[PDB]
Amino acid sequence: SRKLILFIVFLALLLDNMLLTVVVPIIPSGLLFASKATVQLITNPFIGLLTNRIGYPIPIFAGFCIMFVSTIMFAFSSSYAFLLIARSLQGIGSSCSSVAGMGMLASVYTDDEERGNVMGIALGGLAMGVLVGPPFGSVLYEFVGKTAPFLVLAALVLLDGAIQLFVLQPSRVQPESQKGTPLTTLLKDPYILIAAGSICFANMGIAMLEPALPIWMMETMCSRKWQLGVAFLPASISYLIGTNIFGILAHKMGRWLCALLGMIIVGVSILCIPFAKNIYGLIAPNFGVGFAIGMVDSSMMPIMGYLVDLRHVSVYGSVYAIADVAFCMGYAIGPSAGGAIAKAIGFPWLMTIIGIIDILFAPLCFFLRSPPA
Numbered sequence: 001s002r003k004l005i006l007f008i009v010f011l012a013l014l015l016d017n018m019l020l021t022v023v024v025p026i027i028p029s030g031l032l033f034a035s036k037a038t039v040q041l042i043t044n045p046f047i048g049l050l051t052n053r054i055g056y057p058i059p060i061f062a063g064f065c066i067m068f069v070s071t072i073m074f075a076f077s078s079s080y081a082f083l084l085i086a087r088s089l090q091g092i093g094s095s096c097s098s099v100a101g102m103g104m105l106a107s108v109y110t111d112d113e114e115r116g117n118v119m120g121i122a123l124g125g126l127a128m129g130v131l132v133g134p135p136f137g138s139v140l141y142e143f144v145g146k147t148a149p150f151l152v153l154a155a156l157v158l159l160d161g162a163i164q165l166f167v168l169q170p171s172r173v174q175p176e177s178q179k180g181t182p183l184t185t186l187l188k189d190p191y192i193l194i195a196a197g198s199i200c201f202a203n204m205g206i207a208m209l210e211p212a213l214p215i216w217m218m219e220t221m222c223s224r225k226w227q228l229g230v231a232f233l234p235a236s237i238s239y240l241i242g243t244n245i246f247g248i249l250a251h252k253m254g255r256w257l258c259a260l261l262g263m264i265i266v267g268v269s270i271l272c273i274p275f276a277k278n279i280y281g282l283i284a285p286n287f288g289v290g291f292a293i294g295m296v297d298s299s300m301m302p303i304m305g306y307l308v309d310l311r312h313v314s315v316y317g318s319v320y321a322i323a324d325v326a327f328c329m330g331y332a333i334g335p336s337a338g339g340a341i342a343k344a345i346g347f348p349w350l351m352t353i354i355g356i357i358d359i360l361f362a363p364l365c366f367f368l369r370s371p372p373a
């Protein structure tokens, strides 16, 4: 049925982010950090144009064979080249599983109201993956061994792939009934660009904040190392709550208004992080940041599907490749550019710049109220 497709997409995204987050504490123990995101950004539009040619089931199932190969390559690798190869393979997989899975969800839940909350649930998949990533990784790392986390995650990826092969049955290539509108015509749409830009700036704010916040906490607050890991918890829990609630709330409120308010709340929250003196001062603003990132993503993915349905041809592979490029731009240029700006003009000014950009971008979501057909 359809809820099994929703579960498959949720599980793919959850395992993808659990891997992405169990890898990050092991790596130091620069290019490797941005490698997955940039390779996924490169191979997003290709998958977008491919799902319209072979269908959704096959490029979503290749996303389990690529993520499984990446996972096992992480567990039995020592060299730096092999870790880079493993992270690039994870990037290609994730591209396959995010783009093809969101396309499948939008193709199956073909109703504007239902698509909202199923996108919300699939997105909360990423929050549940990031949130349960580090603890699982650590406990399985030290209580069993250093190859343990990745081999157990590989077993989980295999079980998810078994569910995939039993639900989707990717045996045969099935092209779409109608040829989807080209990628350039989509990219010339002022509304698809506004949606992608709102997702891009929200996630770039959060992706520049995550790595820059610990480097500032150890300098201003003299925080211990456990504090650095705990100070970012409100973001993930709040993103989980925000996505799961606003998938259902945004269509009653209006997706344009939910996106506008999410942008303004991300802006204000990020403008209000540098004013915190102690760790208890980074609970409320980080909560606002994560809550509003969810408020924006759970409102702007269904709108992507809707904007394609209303104006262009009903093929969702490319437009969700565009949405996933907007996602990945932030996580690719986040660490590097954020560290560069913080190393040059400081962390408070970086946060003020990001907040100003988000607040000034917010009024552009007004143009999503009633776009013409």
Ligand SMILES: NCCc1c[nH]c2ccc(O)cc12
Binding pocket: 126, 127, 130, 203, 206, 207, 210, 235, 236, 239, 290, 293, 297
């Ligand atoms: N839009 C998903 C981003 C998101 C939610 N919570 C997070 C915590 C850290 C991070 O880099 C990113 C996130």
